[PDB]
Design a binder for this molecule. Structure first.
Ligand SMILES: Cc1cc2nc3c(=O)[nH]c(=O)nc-3n(C[C@H](O)[C@H](O)[C@H](O)COP(=O)(O)OP(=O)(O)OC[C@H]3O[C@@H](n4cnc5c(N)ncnc54)[C@H](O)[C@@H]3O)c2cc1C
Ligand SMILES: Cc1cc2nc3c(=O)[nH]c(=O)nc-3n(C[C@H](O)[C@H](O)[C@H](O)COP(=O)(O)OP(=O)(O)OC[C@H]3O[C@@H](n4cnc5c(N)ncnc54)[C@H](O)[C@@H]3O)c2cc1C
Ligand SMILES: Cc1cc2nc3c(=O)[nH]c(=O)nc-3n(C[C@H](O)[C@H](O)[C@H](O)COP(=O)(O)OP(=O)(O)OC[C@H]3O[C@@H](n4cnc5c(N)ncnc54)[C@H](O)[C@@H]3O)c2cc1C
Ligand SMILES: [Cl-]
Ligand SMILES: [Cl-]
Ligand SMILES: [Cl-]
Lengths: 539, 540, 539
């Protein structure tokens, strides 16, 4: 008699699922792209990462963001950052699963980049902030392994380990390392040539750095690769957190960013007060170096946005299956079932493209593969990271009101999305790069012709899309970089669907994405298969 | 460098990584003297563990990340749960591992257990105080439950005697360890519990339906609370479990979480009972009689807890004062400071002596004379010591100065905790009214005092004069002098202990400083040195 | 049937009362000490300040503490502090009521200091943090008015206004000002001789300051009087927030204290990076100057603590009067009544001593009056500020559990008390100063004897106390500085009680405070009278 009502028609939130085994498109991609040997392991962590206890860690790390500790209680400079225990727990698992170095092990087998991409994608569905140090370390490791200055040769062993080490010590004394990246300044992020951080050559071949970095993520990194001006031009420096003699480097943490999302991750405004750096490569070869690593971090952005889209979608279909409206399961409602099917179709294409791209990276020794990666990485980052926002927003709306409340995973996802689109130059820069590749790089047109010819006749909308692109690649105006990049990206997904997806699935994908007319209805059967694949049972 | 504007110097390193036990001379001597010497090795062991920086950090985390009340889930269903920072649970594990909640109630507990347990308690208290609340309540309630558990809960006996903290959201019977809370206070009264309006109706099966509220309901996550409610037969005490036997959640509704000055790591709720099921303990109307048994022990914990926090505050102060220089010399060498610090050390010596003598009384409660001693000095010790805590800790804070007023320091948290112990369980006045009630109603109280006072007569002139004043001060029966009488009675208790077991110079010092009404007592250079030295260890 | 219980015996909290007219001892003191002309105004603001709306401003200012803005969104240094709107409202009223300068107006009448003290004591009961800038400004004003450097002569008018101006502008362009004091450094606050902030003389006569201040309250002050080392000794500098040319002075705000209490008030850790200062007086004359101001701020500490004890006590008795326990009003319960009466008696004494002490300051032109002030100011600060903690804690306990909750005014008061005892050298330094006056000052022993002889024979306990002080002054050790200062303070209050208080009241006070035998019962008539005077009706 105390109650005013009974609570019903409230679906149970998705948890204790298998992030891997419930993703049909992913299972197929992993095996298809030569990482089948990691399938058992993927399912293993898929189950671990998908538990309530795991998702809670994600929540804790974000709602208890890091504190910047500039001083101690005595008034001495401290320059440290303090995290919630959940942060460290996430790091342990990321490093245990070698998301930061799997591909760089000395005996790493074929498909390692692809396998590692799958491992990454699972973690990304749980928590995103923690991916930042992992992404940076992953991209920087190959570079360091062959360019480490003499005083830090003993970093090789920890760089190749599977142990997270949060000890406040010099890198050489630690079990595992994290590498950060300091490029962006107040005057520019895309245009790094405008940096005003200067480096004066010190004695032993080291340099004195004086300047600042505007966005300096993971200040607790064991080292940052930093860009600074020298007499010889813009160079890249290895700036360790501790000097060889055990003293703390002269990096001053001034301010912690107060971010829309990505809140679990510490992003600082730092200043260099005669900090010591070691020159990597040659003076003026700075931009050339960070361009090598950029390729890989961009891929992580695209993959990360995709992972979050996948999670948001999983939450949405799980909810829509249980929630009833107007007498029927929400997911049975014609208009909803239509929207959800198009969303699933979106993820199928992205899964296909992203893991094809991963294969390219795994086989970068092949000039044709390296060129494929060089081209589609920026494209995938631009398109997928742009889609993230509208896509996650839609998922949120499938849940309705409760999806707009912070107790749900959706707001945090929705809040994270834009960071991936802004990171590393932003969309426009991606598109200018795509244009630059088509123009400057040799044998690009030949590479495209081969793939397009390989699937000609399989689908009318694809072939028409190919014709439209070649017509736009005659007079490629800069102001059409987005149109060109988008169309180029779709053709990439299209080819993959046509080659390896079932004919009905590819027919569906091509129609929905490449049919300019619109009004595209999907067969009852193809919709059922999409939604079924998106919940597993295809593994 | 050229970037700096100054050099940081004369800033002392904060006290950490010390041994909370081995650095307390008075405590080591007390433990051995009061028959708990067998626990000395263990005490030093946890004394080291608890005194580490990592441990102190747990204390800080538990307080600056206070519990959240979860009334509802994301679906709009009632949840009635409380979510803590991991540090809270870590503190609880250690407290239970160290059996601070049940050591004395083990079936084979040896002699001195209450005294040993008091020492274990005192160490923990210096680290974090909030976590002590569930421990204090469970410790006081356990003896009662062990022999009064209703039939459906006989399988609580094993967990009640364990050393395993269990935070699982399950019925008690399925758990490895338990916590018992206490629901007495209502909006209309805390001291006067007969004004309770929570009512209980007897049901067909022997349990009762409770409808009402509790104003301060600490540790709502307890596995059960002993609750007072009105019945047709009068004010009774009920065992109100969090889960019913059939695994369903009892009808206890958590409405509001208190936003407290201190004690913040501990969840204190405003709850309402919506036909919650309770099991009658004892007889209808025997309610106040039951919670009076348990009150004796929780009061002791309040006194000990305040003492522990005073000890910690003092440790921080002397450690600071030893390093900090002012006007060319170590702060602790400055005549006026060294004088204040010595009086503070002297304060703790007396409290240590009295509190652990009291702990012995509880350990030997089978002896009528000991039980009476406890019945008399427990309330007195709670009144005086818990009152002193505030000015005492404030003084410690001032020894550090500006930095002691900042929350990065342990001092503000200690300063903020202190009043809770004085307010808890009736408050100072109630303690004093109780002391007066014992002198009046209880038989052979005057005889008991006479024996102790005679045993030390002639040893100190200020003590004997203090004894004369008390016996006279009792000349006219008067409620409005309850505090004067309770305070004087307390000092005489400490005095006797110092005179019997402390060194003659130490006891001479204590008696002069505490009992010399003519004030202005200077202390010998030697006695001050010995006080401060004892307060840092080396006497163990 | 929805309810589980009925709420009763829950007293209404004290609000919408008159902070002045409810304080019998205060009304009498104001009239007695030559400030009876302000009575109509004191009752006026006493009404305004006691309102719920007023008290709410206090709460807001403290639960929404200031934020330090070291940088703006563009990464340019900003060094500003942002307050809750309630803070500025509190400031507006304080300045409107001239709590910061009443006594320094050019045509200030007799008893201005005593009237200002009364106004201060009322504001102090609503909010304490806001008193910091007021106290500092009040103490520095007289000094500045006759020492202002040439470039800041036009500061005279604003210094004497009733205007609060929070505009971020150079002083000269504002309608009112606030002055701060920067003395304490990390190495010491009591021993300022250990300061390492150094000032070099410049071409133009001003100085370059490089150093730091550990506690630096009201960083938003229009100027700070700062102590720094020069070639000729430790000196006092006028450091304006803006330079004459409008540029911001080189005062760098590094960090904001996270305080036990006093949270509404901004206290900073600051550093000087070649900040411009102007010498006040002669080099090495620094300590001599800040000693002149120290006199008045120490008085404000004592007054503030007294004020907060008064407020606490008002709350306690209003509560005890409504709250029932064991069938009677809590205030009727013999033990409670006894305690509350002693507390009231405590405030009677303090009120008498403080406003006699205020008279001394007002008539400081008389050497005998200045000497009385010189002696009892340090004493009153030591004793009263020390009593504050146990006193307010008692008040809190009268309310019980609800008094321990932050929704009550008690915790905020309780959290405030220690700051007044720590400010300006702390208790020990006060007692050392009192000893220095009894030793180094001439005619002190005479001044005291004149007062004691004037009341000899009126009370046995008072005379016995006098004989014990004179005996304790035979051998005046340093270690007895507290015992001596305490005894002195008591005799001070005692003299005032015996002279101007009703004989029964003076007897009660003497018996309670000076009867070493303890165990004093008070008559039912004197208790009824004490509590009646503490709720007004004597005005
Ligand atoms: C959460 C977070 C963390 C970060 N962490 C780091 C870090 O760890 N290390 C680091 O170095 N940086 C970091 N950054 C900075 C980030 O890399 C840059 O912000 C990003 O590269 C864009 O630089 P910017 O902000 O200066 O944008 P701007 O350079 O001002 O660019 C503005 C816009 O102009 C567009 N644009 C640029 N050139 C052209 C052109 N020729 N034609 C048309 N449009 C153009 C860009 O697409 C962009 O959208 C972080 C940023 C965020 C939000
Ligand atoms: C952090 C915290 C946690 C708490 N947790 C719990 C809990 O878990 N369970 C629980 O039951 N209670 C709890 N309490 C309540 C606490 O036990 C009561 O607040 C306390 O007993 C005082 O009662 P009260 O607040 O009703 O004050 P009142 O009973 O209104 O008394 C107020 C004052 O009156 C004095 N007084 C009472 N009677 C007399 C008399 N005859 N003569 C003179 N003076 C008298 C009291 O000593 C006290 O100073 C908690 C309180 C706090 C602050
Ligand atoms: C909220 C707040 C605001 C503040 N604002 C300001 C401000 O605006 N400007 C400013 O300059 N300071 C400020 N302070 C600091 C305050 O003035 C100092 O902290 C105070 O003077 C004591 O200095 P300290 O902390 O260095 O104590 P210390 O100098 O380390 O003193 C330590 C203790 O030893 C005692 N002592 C010192 N010398 C002796 C001796 N010879 N014999 C016996 N005992 C002795 C002292 O009384 C003190 O209790 C502020 C502090 C607080 C908490
Ligand atoms: Cl900081
Ligand atoms: Cl809730
Ligand atoms: Cl800032």
């Amino acid at each position: 008699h105390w109650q005013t009502h009974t609570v019903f028609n409230q679906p149970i939130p998705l948890n204790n699922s298998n992030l891997y085994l419930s993703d049909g498109a992913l299972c197929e991609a992993v095996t298809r792209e030569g990482a089948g040997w990691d399938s058992d392991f993927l399912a293993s962590i898929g189950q671990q990462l998908g538990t309530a206890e795991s998702l809670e860690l994600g929540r804790l790390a974000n709602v208890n963001p890091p504190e910047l500790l500039r001083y101690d209680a005595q008034g001495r400079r401290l320059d440290d950052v303090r995290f919630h225990p959940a942060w460290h727990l996430l790091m342990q698992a990321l490093c245990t699963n070698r998301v930061h170095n799997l591909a760089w092990e000395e005996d790493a087998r074929s498909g390692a980049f692809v396998a590692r991409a799958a491992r990454f994608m699972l973690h990304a569905q749980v928590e995103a902030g923690s991916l930042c140090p992992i992404t940076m370390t992953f991209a920087a490791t190959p570079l360091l392994l062959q360019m480490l200055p003499a005083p830090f040769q003993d970093w090789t062993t920890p760089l190749l380990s599977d142990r997270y080490d949060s000890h406040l010590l010099p890198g050489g004394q630690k079990r595992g390392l994290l590498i950060g990246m300091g490029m962006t300044e107040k005057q520019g992020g895309s245009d790094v040539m405008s940096n005003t951080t200067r480096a004066e050559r010190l004695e032993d071949g080291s340099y004195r750095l004086v300047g600042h970095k505007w966005f300096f993520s993971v200040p607790q990194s064991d080292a940052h690769l930093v860009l600074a001006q020298t007499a010889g031009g813009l160079s890249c420096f290895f700036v360790p957190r501790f000097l060889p003699d055990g003293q703390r480097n002269a990096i001053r943490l001034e301010r912690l960013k107060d971010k829309l999302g990505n809140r679990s991750n510490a992003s600082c405004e730092v200043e260099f007060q005669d900090a010591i750096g070691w020159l990597l490569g040659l003076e003026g070869e700075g931009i050339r170096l960070i361009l090598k690593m950029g390729g890989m971090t961009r891929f992580d952005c695209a993959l990360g946005s995709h992972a979050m889209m996948r999670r948001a979608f999983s939450l949405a279909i799980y909810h829509a299956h249980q929630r009833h409206v107007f007498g029927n399961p929400l997911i049975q409602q014609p208009l909803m079932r239509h929207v959800l099917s198009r969303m699933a179709l979106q993820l199928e294409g992205q899964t296909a493209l992203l893991f094809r791209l991963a294969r390219a990276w795994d086989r970068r020794a092949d000039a044709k593969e390296a060129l494929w990666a060089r081209l589609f990485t920026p494209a995938a980052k631009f398109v997928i990271c742009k889609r993230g926002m509208p896509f996650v927003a839609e998922a949120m709306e499938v849940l309705g009101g409760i999806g707009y409340c912070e107790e749900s995973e959706l707001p945090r996802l929705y809040r994270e999305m834009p960071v991936n689109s802004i990171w590393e130059g932003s969309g426009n820069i991606m598109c200018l790069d795509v244009l630059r590749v088509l123009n400057k790089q040799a044998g690009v047109y030949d590479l495209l012709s081969e793939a397009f010819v390989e699937v000609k006749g399989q689908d009318r909308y694809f072939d028409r899309a190919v014709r439209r692109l070649q017509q736009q690649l005659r007079k490629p105006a800069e102001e059409l970089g987005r149109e060109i990049t988008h169309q180029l990206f779709l053709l990439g997904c299209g080819a993959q669907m046509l080659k390896y997806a079932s004919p009905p699935m590819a027919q569906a994908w091509c129609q929905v994405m490449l049919d300019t007319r619109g009004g595209v209805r999907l067969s009852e059967q193809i919709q059922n298969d999409l939604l079924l694949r998106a919940t597993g049972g295809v593994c």
